[PDB]
Amino acid sequence: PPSEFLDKLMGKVSGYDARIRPNFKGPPVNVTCNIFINSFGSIAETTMDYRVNIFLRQQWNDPRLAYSEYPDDSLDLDPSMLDSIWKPDLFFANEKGANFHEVTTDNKLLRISKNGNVLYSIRITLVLACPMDLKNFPMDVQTCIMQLESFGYTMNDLIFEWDEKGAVQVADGLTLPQFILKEEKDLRYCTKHYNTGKFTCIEARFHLERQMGYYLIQMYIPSLLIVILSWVSFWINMDAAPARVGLGITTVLTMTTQSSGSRASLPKVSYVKAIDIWMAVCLLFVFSALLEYAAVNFIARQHKKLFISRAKRIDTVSRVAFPLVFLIFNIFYWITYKI
Amino acid sequence: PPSEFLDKLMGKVSGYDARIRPNFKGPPVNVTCNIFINSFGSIAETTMDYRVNIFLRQQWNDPRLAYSEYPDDSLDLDPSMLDSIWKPDLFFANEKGANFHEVTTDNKLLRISKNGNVLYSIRITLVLACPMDLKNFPMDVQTCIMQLESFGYTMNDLIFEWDEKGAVQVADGLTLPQFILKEEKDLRYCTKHYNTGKFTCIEARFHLERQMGYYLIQMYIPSLLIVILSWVSFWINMDAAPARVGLGITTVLTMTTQSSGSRASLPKVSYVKAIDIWMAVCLLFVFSALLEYAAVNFIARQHLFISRAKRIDTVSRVAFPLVFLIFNIFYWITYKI
Amino acid sequence: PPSEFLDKLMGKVSGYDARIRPNFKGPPVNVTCNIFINSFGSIAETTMDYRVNIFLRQQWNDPRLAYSEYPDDSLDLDPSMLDSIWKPDLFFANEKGANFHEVTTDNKLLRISKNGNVLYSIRITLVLACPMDLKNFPMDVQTCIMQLESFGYTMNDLIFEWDEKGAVQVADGLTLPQFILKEEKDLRYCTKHYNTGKFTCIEARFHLERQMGYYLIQMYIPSLLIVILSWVSFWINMDAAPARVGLGITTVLTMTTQSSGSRASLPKVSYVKAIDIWMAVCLLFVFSALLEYAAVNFIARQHFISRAKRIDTVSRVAFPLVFLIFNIFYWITYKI
Amino acid sequence: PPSEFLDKLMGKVSGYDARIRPNFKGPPVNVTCNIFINSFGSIAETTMDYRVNIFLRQQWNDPRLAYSEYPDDSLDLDPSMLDSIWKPDLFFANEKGANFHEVTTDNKLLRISKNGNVLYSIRITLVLACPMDLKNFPMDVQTCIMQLESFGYTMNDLIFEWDEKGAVQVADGLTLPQFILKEEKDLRYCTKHYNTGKFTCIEARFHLERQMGYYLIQMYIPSLLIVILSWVSFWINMDAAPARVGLGITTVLTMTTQSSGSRASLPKVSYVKAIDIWMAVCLLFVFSALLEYAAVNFIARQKLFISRAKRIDTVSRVAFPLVFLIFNIFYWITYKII
Amino acid sequence: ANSTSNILNKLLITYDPRIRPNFKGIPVEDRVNIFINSFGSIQETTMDYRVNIFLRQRWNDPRLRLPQDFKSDSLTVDPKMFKCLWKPDLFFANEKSANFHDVTQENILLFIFRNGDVLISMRLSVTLSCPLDLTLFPMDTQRCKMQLESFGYTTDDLQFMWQSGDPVQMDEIALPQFDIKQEDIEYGNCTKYYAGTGYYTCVEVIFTLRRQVGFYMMGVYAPTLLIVVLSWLSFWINPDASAARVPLGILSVLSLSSECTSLASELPKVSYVKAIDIWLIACLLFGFASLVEYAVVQVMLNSAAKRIDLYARALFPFSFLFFNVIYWSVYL
Numbered sequence A: 001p002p003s004e005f006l007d008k009l010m011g012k013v014s015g016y017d018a019r020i021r022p023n024f025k026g027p028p029v030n031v032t033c034n035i036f037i038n039s040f041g042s043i044a045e046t047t048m049d050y051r052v053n054i055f056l057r058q059q060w061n062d063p064r065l066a067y068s069e070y071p072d073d074s075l076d077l078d079p080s081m082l083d084s085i086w087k088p089d090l091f092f093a094n095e096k097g098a099n100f101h102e103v104t105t106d107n108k109l110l111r112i113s114k115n116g117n118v119l120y121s122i123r124i125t126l127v128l129a130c131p132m133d134l135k136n137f138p139m140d141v142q143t144c145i146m147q148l149e150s151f152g153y154t155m156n157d158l159i160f161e162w163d164e165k166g167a168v169q170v171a172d173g174l175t176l177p178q179f180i181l182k183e184e185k186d187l188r189y190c191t192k193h194y195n196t197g198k199f200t201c202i203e204a205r206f207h208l209e210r211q212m213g214y215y216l217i218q219m220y221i222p223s224l225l226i227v228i229l230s231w232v233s234f235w236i237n238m239d240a241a242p243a244r245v246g247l248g249i250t251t252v253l254t255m256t257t258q259s260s261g262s263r264a265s266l267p268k269v270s271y272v273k274a275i276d277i278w279m280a281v282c283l284l285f286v287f288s289a290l291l292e293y294a295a296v297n298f299i300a301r302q303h304k305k306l307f308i309s310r311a312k313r314i315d316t317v318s319r320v321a322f323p324l325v326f327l328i329f330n331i332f333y334w335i336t337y338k339i
Numbered sequence B: 001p002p003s004e005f006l007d008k009l010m011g012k013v014s015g016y017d018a019r020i021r022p023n024f025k026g027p028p029v030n031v032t033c034n035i036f037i038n039s040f041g042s043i044a045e046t047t048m049d050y051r052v053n054i055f056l057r058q059q060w061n062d063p064r065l066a067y068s069e070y071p072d073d074s075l076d077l078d079p080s081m082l083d084s085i086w087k088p089d090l091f092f093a094n095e096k097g098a099n100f101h102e103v104t105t106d107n108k109l110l111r112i113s114k115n116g117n118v119l120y121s122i123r124i125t126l127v128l129a130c131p132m133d134l135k136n137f138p139m140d141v142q143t144c145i146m147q148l149e150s151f152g153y154t155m156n157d158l159i160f161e162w163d164e165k166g167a168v169q170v171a172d173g174l175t176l177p178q179f180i181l182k183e184e185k186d187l188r189y190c191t192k193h194y195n196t197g198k199f200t201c202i203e204a205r206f207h208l209e210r211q212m213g214y215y216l217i218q219m220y221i222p223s224l225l226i227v228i229l230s231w232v233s234f235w236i237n238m239d240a241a242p243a244r245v246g247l248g249i250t251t252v253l254t255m256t257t258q259s260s261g262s263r264a265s266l267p268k269v270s271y272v273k274a275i276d277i278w279m280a281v282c283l284l285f286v287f288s289a290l291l292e293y294a295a296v297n298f299i300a301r302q303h304l305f306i307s308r309a310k311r312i313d314t315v316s317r318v319a320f321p322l323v324f325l326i327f328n329i330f331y332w333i334t335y336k337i
Numbered sequence C: 001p002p003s004e005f006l007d008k009l010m011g012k013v014s015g016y017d018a019r020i021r022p023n024f025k026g027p028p029v030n031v032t033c034n035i036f037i038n039s040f041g042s043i044a045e046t047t048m049d050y051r052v053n054i055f056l057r058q059q060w061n062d063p064r065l066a067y068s069e070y071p072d073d074s075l076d077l078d079p080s081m082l083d084s085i086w087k088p089d090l091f092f093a094n095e096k097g098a099n100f101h102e103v104t105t106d107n108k109l110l111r112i113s114k115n116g117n118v119l120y121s122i123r124i125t126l127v128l129a130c131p132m133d134l135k136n137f138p139m140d141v142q143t144c145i146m147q148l149e150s151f152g153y154t155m156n157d158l159i160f161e162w163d164e165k166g167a168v169q170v171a172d173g174l175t176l177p178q179f180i181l182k183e184e185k186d187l188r189y190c191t192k193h194y195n196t197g198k199f200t201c202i203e204a205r206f207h208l209e210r211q212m213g214y215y216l217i218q219m220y221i222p223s224l225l226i227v228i229l230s231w232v233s234f235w236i237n238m239d240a241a242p243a244r245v246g247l248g249i250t251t252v253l254t255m256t257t258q259s260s261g262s263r264a265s266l267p268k269v270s271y272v273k274a275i276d277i278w279m280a281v282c283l284l285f286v287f288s289a290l291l292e293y294a295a296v297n298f299i300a301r302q303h304f305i306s307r308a309k310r311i312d313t314v315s316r317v318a319f320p321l322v323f324l325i326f327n328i329f330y331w332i333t334y335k336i
Numbered sequence D: 001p002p003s004e005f006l007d008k009l010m011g012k013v014s015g016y017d018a019r020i021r022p023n024f025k026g027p028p029v030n031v032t033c034n035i036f037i038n039s040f041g042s043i044a045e046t047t048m049d050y051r052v053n054i055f056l057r058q059q060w061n062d063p064r065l066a067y068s069e070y071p072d073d074s075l076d077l078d079p080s081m082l083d084s085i086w087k088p089d090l091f092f093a094n095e096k097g098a099n100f101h102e103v104t105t106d107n108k109l110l111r112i113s114k115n116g117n118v119l120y121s122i123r124i125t126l127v128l129a130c131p132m133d134l135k136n137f138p139m140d141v142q143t144c145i146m147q148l149e150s151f152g153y154t155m156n157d158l159i160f161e162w163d164e165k166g167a168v169q170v171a172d173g174l175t176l177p178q179f180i181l182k183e184e185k186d187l188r189y190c191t192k193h194y195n196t197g198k199f200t201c202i203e204a205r206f207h208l209e210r211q212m213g214y215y216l217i218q219m220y221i222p223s224l225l226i227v228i229l230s231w232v233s234f235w236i237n238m239d240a241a242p243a244r245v246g247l248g249i250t251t252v253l254t255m256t257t258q259s260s261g262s263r264a265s266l267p268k269v270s271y272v273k274a275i276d277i278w279m280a281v282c283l284l285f286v287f288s289a290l291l292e293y294a295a296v297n298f299i300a301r302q303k304l305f306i307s308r309a310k311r312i313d314t315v316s317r318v319a320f321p322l323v324f325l326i327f328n329i330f331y332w333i334t335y336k337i338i
Numbered sequence E: 001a002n003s004t005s006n007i008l009n010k011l012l013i014t015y016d017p018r019i020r021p022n023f024k025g026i027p028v029e030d031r032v033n034i035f036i037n038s039f040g041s042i043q044e045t046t047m048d049y050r051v052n053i054f055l056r057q058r059w060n061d062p063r064l065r066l067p068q069d070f071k072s073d074s075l076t077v078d079p080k081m082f083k084c085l086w087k088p089d090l091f092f093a094n095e096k097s098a099n100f101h102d103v104t105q106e107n108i109l110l111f112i113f114r115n116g117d118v119l120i121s122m123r124l125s126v127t128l129s130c131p132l133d134l135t136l137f138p139m140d141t142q143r144c145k146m147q148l149e150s151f152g153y154t155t156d157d158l159q160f161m162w163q164s165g166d167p168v169q170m171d172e173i174a175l176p177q178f179d180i181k182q183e184d185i186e187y188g189n190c191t192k193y194y195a196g197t198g199y200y201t202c203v204e205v206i207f208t209l210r211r212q213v214g215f216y217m218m219g220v221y222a223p224t225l226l227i228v229v230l231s232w233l234s235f236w237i238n239p240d241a242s243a244a245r246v247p248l249g250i251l252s253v254l255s256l257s258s259e260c261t262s263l264a265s266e267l268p269k270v271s272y273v274k275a276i277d278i279w280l281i282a283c284l285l286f287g288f289a290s291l292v293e294y295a296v297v298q299v300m301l302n303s304a305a306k307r308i309d310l311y312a313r314a315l316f317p318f319s320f321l322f323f324n325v326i327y328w329s330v331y332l
């Protein structure tokens, strides 16, 4: 029958004790890790988090769990008897949360080969955390870290290793609303040293690039709109204008309110993000409109024919000057950040 | 004495192991699946998920559970001892969160036929992840999928098949606040292949339509109206420089806020969308009109010439509202066909 | 003795089987249901559900559990031995989440009479979803439904019934902030049929009304005063060009923003709401005053004077008059 | 030996039935309750809730638990065996969300005295429903309710009593951010009646008083500055209509935007909060400033008329100050004495 | 054969896990140190922060001395079988809530020696409450605590003491807003006395952190400053700008008025002034003082010699410069 073989091993007779470890008082046991990414979640910028759903596979060779009476190789087992094996401890350092699923049954896979190799697959959801540098907020490349350690065992007992081929496998068709996940991923070692001792650790890092599509429509084009709109003052009327003040102020005021929304979603940071310098420099240009007019207005009132001629002369010079100086700022700003 | 019959099968005397699949080392087990949509809703566009409540039920054949001494057609076994019978390891691949419903008793049902058929029904609430296509954000059709897959059993042991009649059922009087659920549902087989092996999976797809009875009043009707208010400036006297400048700027600025407001409740995607292309061209319309009055003033007050100044204004009174309708025809017909 | 009695007739020696319904292979059992409502939670509009906290009481008969030696009428048992008794399955069809309460012990009550009448009480919190129709969103009577079902057994085994007197009890002093709960409740039979079989169910429905106080202060009165403010342009000088164009545009903007804020807290339904009638009709009145000032300017600019003023003074009486006419339609149909 | 006496006291040999209350077929059991408060706050008006962290102590007298052999007066027992002893069933009627604490081990305390007295302490967190009255919202006083009852035992079996001294002991330096917790507490009895029977209950009331500092600096003083500004119009000449109307339209509209900000976090309730009355009446004052200018404009239609316009301007220059002063005095003195 | 031999110590000999080590005798002394993996999420609104810690309790049990079972210096007990030994009932008293971290195996370590010591280590995520002093908001220094105490055992049985070498170890954590410091107080005694139960041990660690001023200067001051600077240009403008001087003043004060409420939106509901409110009101007065100077210019003309404007162009920028000097020096 099927039943005795399941009972003969992993059973009270000739007892397999889960507490002890494979190759006890001997060389450290090798663990090979594979990760498959089912879905990549929302990267909420406010709380430095990104949700990841993965299948985690661990492969190791337990010499005790070996058989030769059954000729079939790699027989599968019920996930309901997983309690009586040695399983290697594993945890993610950068986590903030984790859970299993338990939809209908226990979503775990156990596979035992003839020699003793064991494959163990678990479905887990992770909310990891990523340090970020927002020096150039609209045009930036970010790095996300996946880091695996052992909690209760040192390198004299347990060592982690990455799989030789296909270590991290992205599901086909995965795409993010605001990030492109580059297919080049770097795998490196980062050993943890604490006062208790050394623990094994592996690290896989992803690179993400942010595209400038949404920001142009939402922010840059309305910001470029106002400064052009404020420019109407030069040809709107002659020097006699209460209205010329009116256009200038409402453009200045709405620029500040648009500034608040720009970083409202983003986390507060001391350093000067590249999005601020665009708004701050553009803020001066609309601000400079009123100062020019008051200089014009002052010249007009100082008449007590040559004075009036100067007032027009100021305008004509500045009609050509402002497009020129704005061009200089526009070419310099975009070139340096793209490079 | 019903008690002795209950434990005669599955008892230690029977030796019914619960870790050994039926027809071991033989033909794979064939399971027929039905779902009953108890409730639907909670569609969130920002995080791309929806919440459903389903009655899942499965049917498979177990030769070991063959009894013949009672003449009853079926036996109503108690829902408490499900822990000691074989059940398939079904799971949802595209989900994000699920849980069982425990309110008074464990919401399980089991029934045993004479020949050995097993019927097993559970109640579960699912949160499922579906991709969103917002290229034409208001007028869009979204297909939401539901994948049922076996986790630990290769296809040579467990095969999933839909029922031949009534594969997906919908509870009577079910409706959504915003969307509608079409009666046609698409069933397909999408077998998954990983490096570990080959696994079975069956897919059911629903189609959803976005009703317009909200976005018309919320977005279309207000921002359309403001374009009419921009046009009234052309009747005002040419010398009302505070007045003409005053009206022009505000109507531009006020619906920059509305344009930003429009996108507040929708995902932050880079690709241009249908609601966006309407706002921008309206913004170009009102912004252009303000530049006319500047062009009117400069050419007029420089010093007969008034005839040119009147000419620019009077041709605008007919040209500006007319050119809206030729755009309006093009945009409306393309999206709705 | 106390110890011997506890396990003599529900124990191994008696051989009471918990997994077997009373009167097996016989007539079905009748379970009598009672409910006490402690707190009735908030009716959320966006997540489309509400909350309640109730005591659920079930009464039935089990012929197996009888006794005659002890003359006491009832045997108040420990609430931690409920695994040894048969408990009918009860099911809330329209639920979104339910929990037990375990602040101390587990809040359960059992009582066995002499004939076998078992009484069983639990404290349950519930999140129940009920559809609501918002065509008359400011004022509307609404109905919230609650269903008691049986997941496992068919008609041949389990039949649910309501109590003969006082099926539903309401705790004294219960008052809702945003709603009024009516005294009368409807009890109905809605037997369910599925391809599995026929399952019993009973239904209790509550009627709710709205306060109407909050909305009058919140948006009705601010909207109304804005309409009055726009009308002061008529008596200002016609020659004052910036004054009346500034007055008209600012009036428009406060209405268009205020209209959107009202619907922010409500679901994005597709039928037009009663509130939306008020907001649109006022905005049309607000916008109408701007057109009048454009009419007088063109008539004045071209190069009579009596005609230009005549439309203004007629409008002074006309614009207030029409608005009051609109009210008498609005406040009779909805409140009838 | 230590191990044997735990087993011997309440064991199969002892024949202690954890499911039988003491004093069976006799007098009802007495219960004494003590409450200590660790944390208090996070009062949310929208949900009508507040969260507490408490130590709850219950004391009774089960005769069968006497230990003659050990000479010590008190014995502290491990919480691992705490589930094998009879413990009364308690719950809170206005409870909404309650959780235990398991940060390293269960937060429970068990003490047994020689005469049979049992002391049992639990660390619990509670979310409780407290109805409120918002008739005078910035100057209101609320009364939180805590109820402790017995779910399954009639007074023929279980009776609840407060401590003889009374034990509601707030911790040191509990500084609420928005409220000022008073020292006086109220302890009352309110016996519950149901169709199943009668059940015991005890109730403790807290008194909370709201601070007025934030509301004046956030709402009142900013509103006051808007009203005081509008007065500049009377000084301004009667011929700059763009100049006057411009201030008028801004003042009335912005106050409305400020007006909405008051009830943004408040619950939606039928009755009128006192904050509304202040904001509504001062909305009238700014509104009147718009109507008065039109009357100056309207009368200007023609040297006898231009004098009258001056008359209206000057008389409003004095009387309008006076009426605002009178309103403030009446509003403040009435609510504060209450 | 070397699994049952060491399990003899715990089960087959009746090691009663409900009995304290060194019973009927001296109290047990616990050496404690904590490792802080992640520091972040300091929310003013709900008055709490979140930190991830590695609590390491250490005591000495006379029964479990490993008496020649094995020849190693240390015996690495697996994370399992942690329910058959005595452990201190530590709990935090400023805990709003806490939870364990179970991913794959439980994150628990047990490390016994020959001398009967124990080095249990445990991973926790704790939400702790921190009272905040915001009398000086933009230039602030905040002080937080952690309180470890035993619920069930008194001081004559359980005593908590901080390690000597390294009680708290940072892990290169950096905060977005606050600038933490490398020096910690780390000592306290905190010993409690509850009415009717008695003494209990406690010991606390105090974390000194300081807020950064970069964001506020760009977010709050620089927009505010230019709005005040903006109003100076009206003085040059002719007094006959009938509805030009009037907005230049009233649009500046409403913008500031709308701004000041929004700026103090995130912060909690507190009665006391916070010195960001001083700046807002002082700027609101100056913008208001720009409006009134035009209204008096208008009143005296309608009676000339309007010299009020000619000196106001000097005074208003000059007085604002002096107020800046005092404010910056005082709050430093």
Ligand SMILES: *[C@@H]1O[C@H](CO)[C@@H](O)[C@H](O)[C@H]1NC(C)=O
Residues within 6 Å of the ligand: A023, A027, A028, A029, A030, A159
């Ligand atoms: C694990 O891998 C390391 C690195 O190759 C090796 O030194 C060690 O012997 C391996 N452990 C075994 C074979 O048990």
Ligand SMILES: *[C@@H]1O[C@H](CO)[C@@H](O)[C@H](O)[C@H]1NC(C)=O
Residues within 6 Å of the ligand: B023, B027, B028, B029, B030
């Ligand atoms: C399942 O179906 C396949 C073909 O559809 C068949 O070959 C197989 O025998 C079936 N399984 C059983 C147990 O009959």
Ligand SMILES: *[C@@H]1O[C@H](CO)[C@@H](O)[C@H](O)[C@H]1NC(C)=O
Residues within 6 Å of the ligand: C027, C028, C029, C030
């Ligand atoms: C109660 O149960 C009996 C037998 O179980 C059945 O005959 C009867 O119809 C049920 N209902 C009533 C109201 O008696």
Ligand SMILES: *[C@@H]1O[C@H](CO)[C@@H](O)[C@H](O)[C@H]1NC(C)=O
Residues within 6 Å of the ligand: D027, D028, D029, D030, D159, D161
């Ligand atoms: C304690 O209970 C007994 C029960 O007989 C009662 O007589 C006595 O008054 C109670 N003590 C109180 C209420 O202080």
Ligand SMILES: *[C@@H]1O[C@H](CO)[C@@H](O)[C@H](O)[C@H]1NC(C)=O
Residues within 6 Å of the ligand: E001, E002, E069
């Ligand atoms: C077990 O420990 C003993 C010492 O007690 C040692 O001699 C032996 O080598 C170890 N291993 C086995 C398999 O006995």
Ligand SMILES: *[C@@H]1O[C@H](CO)[C@@H](O)[C@H](O)[C@H]1NC(C)=O
Residues within 6 Å of the ligand: E155, E159, E160, E161, E162, E187, E188, E189, E190, E201, E202, E203
């Ligand atoms: C008392 O305070 C000191 C501070 O130096 C601390 O080291 C000690 O552990 C405290 N005592 C107890 C019993 O916690």
